[PDB]
């Protein structure tokens, strides 16, 4: 059935979302709700979901994507219907025109600006990113793109979400993120911050060497620890007790090794929805920095493009408050014949411009491989 | 007077300017936007969203906006970030290219097809309409267009609604004479208009036309049909209705209209103005009998989409009160282009040429405001 759901994905589906706990296909937009203030959005969403129940939807969910920038308007959709199966089980089965935005040198310049700002003590952490515009000579087949991603993403979250357009052709957010922002199942809360990276190698000896190096890198370990501390501080008020592992683990996608910690807690209040928790966490320092509003102003000033939905959050939440929200990375906006791909790299005082550029390239591979351009 | 200041403060970004005989509203921003697929279950969602807006802040928040002619489309309204509401208003060179879409023949072709289908007993009443694209040499000053409409519309409903964009700002602007429905406590009022004649600058001829409309059997009969449909829609919601025996005549600067004020007293305090509007929308005055059949004929014959024209627009509050108007004598304005609209009810005994003239007379409200009267 799960593979049926992947086969049934159309550009009028509102969400495909393949996680390790399930696969969801949501069709249509029965209700869309937009709101000016992220902080008061969870209560509006619950009111909309209650209405949906009482108007005769037996399992109302919201699905969609929220932007990187918390100050922007937010929006989610209650679909007409949704199907929910077990997780996906799969055996692997033109001119393109590239325009980097910005070019490699302007990106590196921006990286020097971030370093400087930290060396003056204005910021502790900064993640700087860049994008890549791809024009195809044919119309991109979203459903095939989605399948390529799913087949090559055993452990993360494969997704497609319909996004706000003008009435232009449909705009879809598509990708394969390794990173859970938060989930809620019953009263159990889990968040999985990822911070620290090395690219995979096809040489199995080198591949393992890089996992070991990441796992013993003082700069990466310390920086990971700081991201974990911030996730734990944001979840602590909502929970009885928090379990925060003393040691990170190494996880992988096909393209990258990542340091990873699963932070787990039991809620105090059964009405605290997964959405509320996602909003309490968003954006984590892994995609933004510390202090967030300062890292964000630095980010907004240095980056010559709008991240829009990249490094935002996306997922679903139900009437009981259960849900899953992922950090939106290893992804692309797809519209007709064009895509915008995105990638970013954590920057610190010690950082080196070329290495950071190299890291963004290694991170682009998830999407480029799905397009046959790796 | 605050009312006039609200008209002066109107901006292209404002979600709603709405000047009615009971109040003037200027609504800014978008605290919450709600969009829904099924018009029939929209009222309850809208109340859910208004309740939430209260729980977050002000005691009796409102929704504002415009819904389309075609009831099967997605519908959308906005709870504004803030609104000022005052008493009713008490108010005291660019070149233009014009293009009829369709042209005057294609439109009369359409009306013939319409007469044809009523004579075969498929339809009883059909409204057919056309539009008039306009290109300006400059950017249209929307605020000034709004003031012109308001000044020349003492008795109607003058509005500017920010519409879902194409990229450049899109505004629905107009001065409608027709209340679809209001609610005030348990009191409901609808004012169907059906039957018209253009005003004349010769006051003897002006009065003659009024008197002729008021006693035309064809027009009285068609008016009584519209009145029956209003009553029909309202009956299930009211313990009592007052339906006047006969219509009066009312005027805008452009037109005489046959008018009936239908009043009711609701059974249920929780019935919102928006819910009544939906029960009424669209009336046979702009669509036809049967509605589903005549709308099919309308979609099939008309070479443009009406979109918001002959839709409904207005406001509703958390208590349930509100005012919704029939969106006529209006235009979509974008940058330096307007699309003006006008329509004319068609029956078996209709004459194609008289409907073309009737529609051109209906265009005068908007044309006059542009200085093209």
From TrEMBL, chain B:
EC number, UniProt record: 5.4.4.2
Molecular-function GO term, any one: isochorismate synthase activity
Organism: Bacillus anthracis (anthrax bacterium)
Protein name stated in the entry: Isochorismate synthase EntC
Family assignment from sequence similarity: Belongs to the isochorismate synthase family.
Record-linked Pfam families: Chorismate_bind
Protein task: Involved in the biosynthesis of the siderophore enterobactin (macrocyclic trimeric lactone of N-(2,3-dihydroxybenzoyl)-serine). Catalyzes the reversible conversion of chorismate to isochorismate.
Residue ranges of domain Chorismate-utilising enzyme C-terminal in the record: 104-362
